[PDB]
Subunit: 295 residues, 4 copies
């Protein structure tokens, strides 16, 4: 037998950093969870109990904290690129660093209509994420995402004209609830290395803001024919607004809200145009996925 693939490192590394403006007294906080997994000439750690080739996961943890101390942690695409570049440059026998970052929301509080200098609220479980693959000889592959963006619209969703056969019970509808948890990923053009990433730094926050704005406006404004048709329009618009993105991927649950027939009770009318009270379904759920790229 032989090692066909191996990666190892530290997962679930919680990191906080504060920036303090001494003149203005304004503080800014960043919180993330970091995973770094390394590849390279490490097969003998598995086959021959040779630990000499292991950079200890505990050392990888220390390096994440040291990197946060000595570099900007924003945007996460940059921090991930710096972190991954460190491991392949520092260690000759390490050839790849896979960096996953989840960013947690700390939104500045407004108190009496004025932004507070050092108080923050977690205003959603929505995350901004990166996957940064730094591969020696092959540059830096970045996937940026937002996830856990939970939305609902109470009308202007439809689902009719789907295939009907002996497996089909679902009634066509011209007015239903649509609710999802938005998982949207944009894949960047391959970067040659850390210098190229640094040259595009302003595009990271700008493309995240674009992806979020397009997601929310399209969801709110689309008279939706299907999750499929709505998510495609989001992906189209994002591609049109950032030439350095090669693909946009959506993964969207259809979080079903079922009508409740109450006509068995005193002829209560709670379906179609009279539908007021619904049963949100925890499971099952539709799961709809698309990767959109350029002609």
């Amino acid at each position: 037998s032989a090692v066909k693939a191996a990666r190892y490192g530290k997962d679930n590394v919680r990191v906080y950093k504060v920036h303090k403006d001494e003149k203005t007294g304004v503080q800014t906080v960043y919180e993330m969870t970091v995973c770094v997994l390394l590849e390279g000439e490490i097969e003998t750690s598995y086959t021959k109990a040779d630990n000499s080739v292991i950079v200890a996961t505990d050392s990888i943890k220390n390096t994440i904290y040291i990197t946060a101390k000595q570099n900007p942690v924003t945007p996460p695409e940059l921090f991930g690129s710096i972190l991954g570049t460190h491991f392949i440059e520092k260690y000759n026998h390490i050839h790849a660093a896979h960096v996953n970052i989840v960013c947690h929301r700390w939104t500045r509080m407004d108190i009496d209509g004025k932004p507070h200098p050092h108080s923050f609220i977690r205003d959603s479980e929505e995350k901004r994420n990166v996957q940064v693959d730094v591969v020696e000889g092959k540059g830096i592959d970045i996937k940026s995402s937002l996830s856990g963006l939970t939305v609902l619209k109470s009308t202007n969703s439809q689902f009719w004209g789907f295939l009907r056969d002996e497996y089909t019970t679902l009634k066509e509808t011209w007015d239903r609830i649509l609710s999802t948890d938005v998982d949207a990923t944009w894949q960047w053009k391959n970067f040659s290395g850390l210098q190229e990433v640094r040259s595009h730094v302003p595009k990271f926050d700008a493309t995240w803001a674009t992806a979020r704005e397009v997601t929310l406006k399209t969801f709110a404004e689309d008279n939706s024919a299907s999750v499929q048709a709505t998510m495609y329009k989001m992906a189209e618009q994002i591609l049109a607004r950032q030439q350095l993105i090669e693909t946009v991927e959506y993964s969207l649950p259809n979080k079903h809200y079922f009508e409740i027939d109450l006509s068995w009770h005193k002829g209560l009318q709670n379906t179609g145009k009279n539908a007021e009270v619904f049963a949100p379904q925890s499971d099952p759920n539709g799961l709809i996925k698309c990767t959109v790229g350029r002609s």
Copy 2:
């Protein structure tokens, strides 16, 4: 042996209601999880397999949907009181209804600076809750709460002058991070029945808003001597602002953010005044509780 206490019913009943203004086309959505547990002359269902005294949990579920269809679901204090009153009035042998409601946030989207008529975002897992105990002959006991309000301040928290003995390692600090998940409960004056609850309906949204605004402002502005001292200021302000509340309870985790000594690495200075990078601690956590009443 004998039944000293019994209650039974349906838990985790997910409910959605929509209001449609056909005039303005503005829709408003409400989503909640409901628990109803009944007490009364039900001992014989346990002792003698006498099901005649059981209002089926399935029927309690149906009753929750029917009540939502025929009544306002807001404020939850009112909806809980109506639901509880229904069971003790409908069924001679049912003497108490315990109604627990978790209200889920559906905040109207702003699209291009304008509130959207029928699109909503879950802005955080913060909940508004009620516990409504409807007890035949003894009226209606309401506890209102907000929970899962997650906040952090980067400075203006201190902890010094605490007891020091052979069990103490904690360093006194004059400048630390304070972060918590706010659980705040206000206990209402006993209400004689549904009529008295109805007569105070506007005070429920008002007092929730007050509790939340006092919580956020006190957290942001208090140069905190301790979790204990800060939470007491929140409770005393809420009591002073609503005479119909008897007590305010706070349950606050101290979600620790530890300094990381990096001086072992190239003399890096990341402690005291130089503290930038911290390790958020998942566990353990301080847990600090107070019930405040009128002196």
Copy 3:
């Protein structure tokens, strides 16, 4: 305003202890999560920012590890009593210690039919718990429990003869699935102090074993008229088997498994006697509670 009630301390303290028999080389492991909340003359920490009365939660954490080092961690009733007694005895102004322990399962592996000296498996998220309230002048109040015991029987459950009115849709059944997550608590006679707890130490493991064995056997053998009737039989048997218990409490969800009518598809028969395929329901769930004492 004034403090009506206060308690504070450390929650989510994860503890592991190993016992090593150097003679046999057999090792035994114990893993628990501990919460300690103190009450006493602490009002001034809330009202006057007087930290002198605070035993730091960090110090309570240290005390938990020190107590584990210097005492048996089993049975948890004993460990809880020692820990609670420590705080009210060590500190003149501390008058109550509330100790909550969750015991995690580490079951010794059998390898090739022989128990392994130092390898363990988590055989299920079932927990053994204690709540130990040590109150100066009022002794030691212990509640013992098992929780997260998940069971299902495929037949020999019934539910018929329940109240039927205009809110009822549920069909009577003479043959259904019954599945639950067993939460069972036994309340001990008040103990005068740690000496009285020590004097009953063997009864703690014995009564836990009895409660679990009665639960499993009654569930498997009762041709169940209802959750109510079955849970009462468990409680009365446990009371009859341990005179030092005053009450037995059960809290049991009814985790519904719905029949699926497939007759719309090729006349497929999957209801009543033909029921093979079911839809397990995540929510809602029946919730059935009983406290049983001596008549």
Copy 4:
């Protein structure tokens, strides 16, 4: 813009099936969660709002229940193969069916040392899983796994001789705790279709039992040089025992148990040979991955 990739279907489909032996009265239960995602000529559902190409996710849900009614649900490799084959055969324009199954443990209860005919316990959150990719023209690709197998050994784990540089603080150890959640996957030789899967049916349960037995014995018996070296020996042994497997993948967290230095307290000795009480770490964790194949 254009669709580069698309799949859609129903996720989180909870399924129960009972087998009843009428002669012996013995019942056997199977519980799973099923996900089916379809690919094919569906791009126009995204680009042109053409629902005519959609087999409704609700219809996919119905088909999962119907398939369970008309076929064996065990082994899951067979059920997944039948389910996936159905969708590509039934619908001309559907070219791939991706079937993910999680199997939940329902272990027969022993009552008074005799297996009960119809009572079951969830004896762990351990899962047995399959991923079945049925691709028209390209056959059936099966990955089988066990996951959530939580184990600990209190000694006979070591970690020394790893790389030491200016990032390294971790002390070499010749005796530590090792605990993990085992995620082990075996990848089958490509199958030409459902007939070939049916011809290997007995190998599925046998290879799962082998993978589990090898995992537990190797973990218990290996005097471990590293997670890397131990997981490699597991993968080797499994490959040696089933020629129809091409690869074995392990993904193993290192769930750290930290020594607690108590020497600051009355010279208490709780490190190295005196280490009895440990702090289990929730995060971070080592994450170690290997895919092992044949020379």
